Each structure stands twice: as structure tokens, then as C-alpha cells.
Amino acid sequence: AKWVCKICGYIYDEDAGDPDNGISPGTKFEELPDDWVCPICGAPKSEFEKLED
């Protein structure tokens, strides 16, 4: 699934993970660390919204 950072527009794609920041591919948004932030603007996880209907 994909989740968008409502602050900058970054898209956390579970399939891609965030390797740069210690998150391998396939890591579900809910399994990210409570301390994980957007790699682009630093917004907390709370500012992400899943892309679903």
C-alpha cells in the first residue's frame, strides 16, 4: 500500500520501503518505527494518509 505525507507530498510506498533510512522493501507503514519520519520533510508518521478509497 502507499501512504502520502500530507506535509510535502512524499509517498511512502510499502513495496519500496525507505532503505536510506534503515527501512527495507516490503515494510508496512504500521511496522515503521514510532520514531520514523518522512525522509523528505521530517514530518511524523501522524501526518501520513493511506491512499485508498
Ligand SMILES: [Fe+3]
Ligand atoms: Fe514529508
